[PDB]
Design an enzyme around this catalytic site. Structure first.
Site, PDB file in Angstrom:
ATOM      1  N   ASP A  35      24.500   2.303 -16.641  1.00  0.00           N
ATOM      2  CA  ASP A  35      25.954   2.470 -16.780  1.00  0.00           C
ATOM      3  C   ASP A  35      26.459   3.603 -15.880  1.00  0.00           C
ATOM      4  O   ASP A  35      26.364   4.778 -16.249  1.00  0.00           O
ATOM      5  CB  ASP A  35      26.320   2.758 -18.245  1.00  0.00           C
ATOM      6  CG  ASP A  35      27.831   2.859 -18.458  1.00  0.00           C
ATOM      7  OD1 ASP A  35      28.560   2.210 -17.690  1.00  0.00           O
ATOM      8  OD2 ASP A  35      28.281   3.579 -19.379  1.00  0.00           O
ATOM      9  N   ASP A 222      31.905   1.015 -11.938  1.00  0.00           N
ATOM     10  CA  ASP A 222      31.275   0.991 -13.261  1.00  0.00           C
ATOM     11  C   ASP A 222      30.333  -0.201 -13.402  1.00  0.00           C
ATOM     12  O   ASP A 222      30.774  -1.312 -13.712  1.00  0.00           O
ATOM     13  CB  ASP A 222      32.335   0.969 -14.357  1.00  0.00           C
ATOM     14  CG  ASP A 222      31.727   1.045 -15.741  1.00  0.00           C
ATOM     15  OD1 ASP A 222      30.511   1.316 -15.838  1.00  0.00           O
ATOM     16  OD2 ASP A 222      32.454   0.829 -16.719  1.00  0.00           O
TER      17      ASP A 222
HETATM   18  C1  LIG Z   1      33.248   8.876 -23.311  1.00  0.00           C
HETATM   19  C2  LIG Z   1      32.516   9.026 -22.003  1.00  0.00           C
HETATM   20  C3  LIG Z   1      32.894   7.931 -20.944  1.00  0.00           C
HETATM   21  C4  LIG Z   1      32.891   6.488 -21.483  1.00  0.00           C
HETATM   22  N1  LIG Z   1      32.949   5.467 -20.389  1.00  0.00           N
HETATM   23  C5  LIG Z   1      33.546   4.288 -20.557  1.00  0.00           C
HETATM   24  O1  LIG Z   1      34.064   3.953 -21.619  1.00  0.00           O
HETATM   25  C6  LIG Z   1      33.532   3.332 -19.369  1.00  0.00           C
HETATM   26  C7  LIG Z   1      34.918   3.255 -18.811  1.00  0.00           C
HETATM   27  C8  LIG Z   1      33.018   1.942 -19.775  1.00  0.00           C
HETATM   28  C9  LIG Z   1      31.501   1.906 -19.910  1.00  0.00           C
HETATM   29  O2  LIG Z   1      30.901   1.618 -18.650  1.00  0.00           O
HETATM   30  C10 LIG Z   1      31.003   0.959 -21.018  1.00  0.00           C
HETATM   31  C11 LIG Z   1      29.485   0.903 -21.119  1.00  0.00           C
HETATM   32  C12 LIG Z   1      29.028  -0.068 -22.221  1.00  0.00           C
HETATM   33  C13 LIG Z   1      29.252   0.544 -23.608  1.00  0.00           C
HETATM   34  C14 LIG Z   1      27.571  -0.528 -22.044  1.00  0.00           C
HETATM   35  C15 LIG Z   1      27.031  -1.452 -23.157  1.00  0.00           C
HETATM   36  C16 LIG Z   1      27.895  -2.697 -23.419  1.00  0.00           C
HETATM   37  C17 LIG Z   1      28.190  -3.542 -22.152  1.00  0.00           C
HETATM   38  C18 LIG Z   1      29.226  -4.605 -22.445  1.00  0.00           C
HETATM   39  N2  LIG Z   1      29.624  -5.429 -21.278  1.00  0.00           N
HETATM   40  C19 LIG Z   1      28.540  -6.252 -20.684  1.00  0.00           C
HETATM   41  C20 LIG Z   1      28.065  -5.641 -19.369  1.00  0.00           C
HETATM   42  C21 LIG Z   1      30.852  -5.521 -20.718  1.00  0.00           C
HETATM   43  O3  LIG Z   1      31.066  -6.248 -19.766  1.00  0.00           O
HETATM   44  C22 LIG Z   1      31.956  -4.640 -21.224  1.00  0.00           C
HETATM   45  C23 LIG Z   1      33.190  -5.156 -21.596  1.00  0.00           C
HETATM   46  C24 LIG Z   1      34.195  -4.289 -22.007  1.00  0.00           C
HETATM   47  O4  LIG Z   1      35.428  -4.727 -22.413  1.00  0.00           O
HETATM   48  C25 LIG Z   1      35.525  -6.056 -22.957  1.00  0.00           C
HETATM   49  C26 LIG Z   1      36.956  -6.294 -23.295  1.00  0.00           C
HETATM   50  C27 LIG Z   1      33.998  -2.918 -22.023  1.00  0.00           C
HETATM   51  C28 LIG Z   1      32.791  -2.395 -21.577  1.00  0.00           C
HETATM   52  C29 LIG Z   1      31.765  -3.256 -21.196  1.00  0.00           C
HETATM   53  C30 LIG Z   1      32.513  -0.933 -21.659  1.00  0.00           C
HETATM   54  O5  LIG Z   1      33.129  -0.220 -22.445  1.00  0.00           O
HETATM   55  N3  LIG Z   1      31.519  -0.460 -20.903  1.00  0.00           N
END
Ligand SMILES: CCCCNC(=O)[C@H](C)C[C@H](O)[C@@H]1C[C@H](C)CCCCCN(CC)C(=O)c2cc(OCC)cc(c2)C(=O)N1
Length: 379
Positions: A35, A222
């Site tokens: 990630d 990302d």
């Molecule tokens: C607080 C510190 C910083 C936090 N960072 C973030 O929140 C980032 C911006 C996002 C992260 O990369 C975050 C990482 C994620 C938990 C990894 C496990 C799950 C993957 C799910 N998946 C398969 C690959 C998606 O496709 C998907 C779909 C999403 O929406 C659907 C409507 C949101 C996110 C991911 C997501 O949330 N992915």
């Protein structure tokens, strides 16, 4: 000397890419999702119906409790756990072992995915966005500080060909994995991997929005999100243009929201009616940018037809965002992406595992001249 790390990523379409890691003494093997959108290293450490295995702190003699709890909310999903440290290695990575911070996940909500084959997450972004605060050193920082691994990594995410694969080259660039030249965009600020989009074209026509809209309120790279996610105003313009280009065919409105699938008889997908998307990124020299071009084969993600798998079915992998642009896995797929932390820049090149359209080709092209690129960053 990176051949050992080629092909070290696996996954299922729409469920993320993972690398195998080991934690503790003796080593406990876990598959860890990669990630670049977060900065915490966390592993399931308690039973969960979707976990096939988890980190057992009591069986590791090198485990050290930090006696401090932690919580991480993502755009989708969240978990809470207990902080500690332990010895970590990457079997198909550099030949080193480091002591790193580990969040032992004890409770979670919409985080683990049924049948994904991964049990933890490796946040590769910067300490600034680590939880509980930026004093919790991220894994890659620990790796660079404790070993001679250079301060950079690259990701080659390959699409189908439901299995998915790729490479995470830790500590360098493997030149056999891409063609043509690498084009670099500055990392605007070291928190997320934040970049600046200076122009957007669809089938060669400028969307002609104020470029600040493309980066409202930020744009990030990302690997942990599947879709290309766009701010409301940009998403609406893009969907309107994509709908118009493909208006010879009828799709339910639920398709354009990611809710419903579209299908066609096997091998008859009308790729030609879906446009190419060009994202122009801020370059390395004054008034200079470059573009990456996305084919419909990237933003129409294939989904296995649950009924009679006689048709080719797809989901629209462009979705609306309220937290800025997210260049997710479908943007990264087909490109070789260099996270050059040492020089504060992200490089893009055409991947050796690129999409094969019969009459069009994904590309990374430059230089372009673009005036006033810094005005495109949102403040
Ligand atoms: C607080 C510190 C910083 C936090 N960072 C973030 O929140 C980032 C911006 C996002 C992260 O990369 C975050 C990482 C994620 C938990 C990894 C496990 C799950 C993957 C799910 N998946 C398969 C690959 C998606 O496709 C998907 C779909 C999403 O929406 C659907 C409507 C949101 C996110 C991911 C997501 O949330 N992915």
């Amino acid at each position: 000397s990176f051949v050992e790390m080629v092909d070290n990523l696996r996954g299922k379409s729409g469920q993320g890419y993972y690398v195998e890691m080991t934690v503790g003494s003796p080593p406990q093997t876990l598959n860890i999702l990669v990630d670049t959108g977060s900065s915490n290293f966390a592993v399931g450490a308690a039973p969960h119906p979707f976990l096939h295995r988890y980190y057992q702190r009591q069986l590791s003699s090198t485990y050290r409790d930090l006696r401090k709890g932690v919580y991480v909310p993502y755009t989708q999903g969240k978990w809470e756990g207990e902080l500690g440290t332990d010895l970590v290695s990457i079997p198909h990575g550099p030949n080193v072992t480091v002591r790193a911070n580990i969040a032992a996940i004890t409770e979670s909500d919409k985080f683990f995915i049924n049948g994904s084959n991964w049990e933890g997450i490796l946040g590769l972004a910067y300490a600034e966005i680590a939880r509980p605060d930026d004093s919790l050193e991220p894994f890659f920082d620990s790796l660079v500080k404790q070993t001679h691994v250079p301060n950079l990594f690259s990701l080659q995410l390959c699409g189908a060909g439901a299995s998915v694969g790729g490479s995470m080259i830790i500590g360098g660039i493997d030149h056999s994995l891409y063609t043509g030249s690498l084009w670099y965009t500055p990392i605007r600020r070291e928190w997320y991997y934040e970049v600046i989009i200076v122009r957007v074209e669809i089938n060669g026509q400028d969307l002609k929005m104020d470029c600040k809209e493309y980066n409202y309120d930020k744009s990030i790279v990302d690997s942990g999100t599947t879709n290309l996610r766009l701010p409301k105003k940009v998403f609406e313009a893009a969907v309107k243009s994509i709908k118009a280009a493909s208006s010879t065919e009828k799709f339910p409105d639920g398709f354009w929201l990611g809710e419903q699938l579209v299908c066609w008889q096997a091998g008859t997908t009308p790729w030609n009616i879906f446009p190419v998307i060009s994202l122009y990124l801020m370059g390395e020299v004054t008034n200079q940018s470059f573009r990456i071009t996305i084919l419909p084969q990237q933003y129409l993600r294939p989904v296995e037809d649950v009924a009679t798998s006689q048709d080719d079915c797809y989901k629209f992998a462009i979705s609306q965002s309220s937290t800025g642009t997210v260049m997710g896995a479908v943007i990264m797929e087909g490109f070789y992406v260099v996270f050059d932390r040492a020089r504060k820049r992200i490089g893009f090149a055409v991947s050796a595992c690129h999409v094969h359209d019969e009459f069009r080709t994904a590309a990374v092209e430059g230089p372009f001249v673009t005036l006033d690129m810094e005005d495109c960053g949102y403040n």
